Design a protein around this ligand. Sequence first.
Ligand SMILES: *[C@@H]1O[C@H](CO)[C@@H](O[C@@H]2O[C@H](CO)[C@@H](O[C@@H]3O[C@H](CO[C@H]4O[C@H](CO)[C@@H](O)[C@H](O)[C@@H]4O)[C@@H](O)[C@H](O[C@H]4O[C@H](CO)[C@@H](O)[C@H](O)[C@@H]4O)[C@@H]3O)[C@H](O)[C@H]2NC(C)=O)[C@H](O)[C@H]1NC(C)=O
Lengths: 175, 124
Amino acid sequence: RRRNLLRNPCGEEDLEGWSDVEHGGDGWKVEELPGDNGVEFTQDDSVKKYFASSFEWCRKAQVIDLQAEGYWEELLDTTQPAIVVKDWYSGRTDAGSLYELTVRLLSENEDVLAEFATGQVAVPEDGSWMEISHTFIDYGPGVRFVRFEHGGQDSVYWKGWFGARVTNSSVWVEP
Amino acid sequence: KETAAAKFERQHMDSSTSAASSSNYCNQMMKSRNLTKDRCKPVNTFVHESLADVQAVCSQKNVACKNGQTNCYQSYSTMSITDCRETGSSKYPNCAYKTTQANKHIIVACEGNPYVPVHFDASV
Ligand SMILES: *[C@@H]1O[C@H](CO)[C@@H](O[C@@H]2O[C@H](CO)[C@@H](O[C@@H]3O[C@H](CO[C@H]4O[C@H](CO)[C@@H](O)[C@H](O)[C@@H]4O)[C@@H](O)[C@H](O[C@H]4O[C@H](CO)[C@@H](O)[C@H](O)[C@@H]4O)[C@@H]3O)[C@H](O)[C@H]2NC(C)=O)[C@H](O)[C@H]1NC(C)=O
């Protein structure tokens, strides 16, 4: 009740598990909570680390295979269970930054059958944490993968790690 | 990368100010927009208009870029600008500059979609 299908949501294991890592600027850097000039993570004390972006877009994805993880075609097709994505993001209090999240459902031909996508958005400049959540339902038949991609950068073009901060990401399936 | 469009923003737009704000302005803007990163950029211009207004130039008088291409656009109004030129005795990493206030039409080069300014070409 319920299992996160994303490897290494908080950089406990640096960047293992994530693919299409794009290192913009001085790339991604794992840091500890609350980071340099940012607010406390209030609501899951098990979370000790976020990933930080730099001065050009940093991205990263994971392509989750619903079968490798334990589901199967006719289940997905007849029951069509809810697939839930959450992400957590923030910015520093001493620079602004941008966030973007794009999450898609793929057929096994890898046609996008459903998408949930923010566009690039300005991260609250008070530095506060944002949870972002979508639930996919009645997406229809042939969902084989969930692709989860997010990214960040600063909007100040600084050296260092002044971009958006991401952590605690999850995808799961539920009744 | 950074796009060749956010570049142009970084190197040429300063919307938050009206005109140059003291003689030290070129020194600060060349630094903070990172035109002094490994070499001193010899020459540079900033534009003290809203980003919108500068976007607009792209659909205005089409002229020959000073390098003889095609896709250059003069602005209809003249704008508030600041030229920055190295001082004799600028030496990296103490890059140093002369500020020059002006109010002239600018000529930018646009490209891609959306159709945005991508180089600063000349002022008139
Ligand atoms: C290109 O352009 C210039 C090259 O000089 C660089 O600009 C500097 O960028 C640095 C960091 O990369 C900035 O440093 C940060 O400054 C922060 C804000 O301070 C402002 O406000 C305070 C008021 O308290 C003043 O001291 C000052 O006027 C500043 O403008 C500080 O908050 C930061 O410190 C915090 O974060 C670091 C964590 O990294 C911690 O070490 C500190 O303890 C603290 O938590 C930080 O120091 C600096 O301000 C920039 N100069 C300016 C004014 O632009 C760009 O970095 C460079 N970028 C590229 C692409 O090369």
